[PDB]
Write a protein that holds these residues in place. Structure first.
Motif, PDB file in Angstrom:
ATOM      1  N   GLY A   1       0.826  -1.219   0.000  1.00 21.53           N
ATOM      2  CA  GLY A   1       0.000   0.000   0.000  1.00 21.53           C
ATOM      3  C   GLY A   1       0.847   1.249   0.000  1.00 21.53           C
ATOM      4  O   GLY A   1       2.033   1.200  -0.323  1.00 21.53           O
ATOM      5  N   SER A   2       0.247   2.364   0.363  1.00 22.84           N
ATOM      6  CA  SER A   2       0.950   3.628   0.423  1.00 22.84           C
ATOM      7  C   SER A   2       1.172   4.049   1.880  1.00 22.84           C
ATOM      8  O   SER A   2       1.107   5.236   2.226  1.00 22.84           O
ATOM      9  N   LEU A   9      12.844   9.009  -4.149  1.00 25.12           N
ATOM     10  CA  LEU A   9      13.542   9.855  -5.101  1.00 25.12           C
ATOM     11  C   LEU A   9      13.930   9.027  -6.327  1.00 25.12           C
ATOM     12  O   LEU A   9      14.380   7.888  -6.194  1.00 25.12           O
ATOM     13  N   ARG A  10      13.736   9.591  -7.510  1.00 22.31           N
ATOM     14  CA  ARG A  10      14.038   8.887  -8.742  1.00 22.31           C
ATOM     15  C   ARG A  10      14.812   9.795  -9.707  1.00 22.31           C
ATOM     16  O   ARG A  10      14.315  10.847 -10.113  1.00 22.31           O
ATOM     17  N   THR A 101       9.518  22.282  -5.712  1.00 26.42           N
ATOM     18  CA  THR A 101       8.605  22.574  -6.792  1.00 26.42           C
ATOM     19  C   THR A 101       7.392  21.654  -6.723  1.00 26.42           C
ATOM     20  O   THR A 101       7.526  20.456  -6.476  1.00 26.42           O
ATOM     21  N   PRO A 102       6.191  22.206  -6.938  1.00 27.09           N
ATOM     22  CA  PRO A 102       4.940  21.437  -6.904  1.00 27.09           C
ATOM     23  C   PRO A 102       4.841  20.451  -8.067  1.00 27.09           C
ATOM     24  O   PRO A 102       3.934  19.622  -8.118  1.00 27.09           O
ATOM     25  N   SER A 103       5.765  20.559  -9.005  1.00 27.12           N
ATOM     26  CA  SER A 103       5.800  19.667 -10.138  1.00 27.12           C
ATOM     27  C   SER A 103       6.579  18.394  -9.791  1.00 27.12           C
ATOM     28  O   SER A 103       6.383  17.344 -10.414  1.00 27.12           O
ATOM     29  N   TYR A 130      10.455  13.353  -7.932  1.00 31.02           N
ATOM     30  CA  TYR A 130      10.164  12.958  -6.576  1.00 31.02           C
ATOM     31  C   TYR A 130       8.840  12.216  -6.546  1.00 31.02           C
ATOM     32  O   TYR A 130       7.809  12.757  -6.935  1.00 31.02           O
ATOM     33  N   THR A 131       8.881  10.978  -6.106  1.00 33.86           N
ATOM     34  CA  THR A 131       7.697  10.157  -6.030  1.00 33.86           C
ATOM     35  C   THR A 131       6.939  10.430  -4.727  1.00 33.86           C
ATOM     36  O   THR A 131       7.426  10.116  -3.634  1.00 33.86           O
ATOM     37  N   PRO A 132       5.746  11.047  -4.827  1.00 32.04           N
ATOM     38  CA  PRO A 132       4.928  11.378  -3.666  1.00 32.04           C
ATOM     39  C   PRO A 132       4.347  10.141  -3.009  1.00 32.04           C
ATOM     40  O   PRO A 132       3.801   9.264  -3.681  1.00 32.04           O
TER      41      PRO A 132
END
Length: 138
Positions: A1-2, A9-10, A101-103, A130-132
């Motif tokens: 799950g999450s 980080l990628r 950055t929001p991106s 960046y993987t949220p």
């Protein structure tokens, strides 16, 4: 799950220009990116001024959030014809910008430099994302 803490980080290596070794030639051209104490390495390219990996790395950051002091240090490790190369080309990618950055995705151009800023003249271009991860604890 999450679940868990949450964070990942990628980084994706595009290419590098003017990659030259202090050796007589290039033996093994591969980037070694160090982030969070994780030694990542990419494929080995042959001897050329422009190797180009087109490969990426992943870092698990769940449980350990990043800060403004979070950055990645990547060293290009080549196999010296004699013994070994202590330093060859080092780049530090400020990952503080990708999380600021929001991106959560940006391309960075990190030159392989030193205190003289004239050790290689090689530029390592990469794309960082960046993987949220929410971190569903409750």
């Amino acid at each position: 799950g999450s679940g868990g803490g949450g964070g990942m980080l990628r980084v994706f290596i595009l290419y590098a220009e003017n990659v030259h070794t202090p050796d007589t030639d290039i033996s093994d051209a591969y980037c070694s990116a160090v982030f969070a104490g994780v030694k990542k390495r990419t494929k080995v390219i042959k001897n050329s001024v422009n190797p180009v990996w087109n490969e990426g790395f992943e870092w698990d950051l769940k449980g350990i959030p990043l800060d403004q002091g979070s950055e990645l240090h990547v060293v290009v490790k080549d196999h010296e014809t004699m013994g070994r190369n202590r330093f060859l080309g080092e780049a530090k990618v400020p990952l503080r910008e990708v999380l600021a950055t929001p991106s959560l995705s940006a391309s960075f151009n990190a030159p392989l430099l030193d205190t003289k800023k004239q050790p290689t003249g090689a530029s390592l271009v990469l794309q960082v994302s960046y993987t949220p991860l929410p971190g569903a604890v409750l």
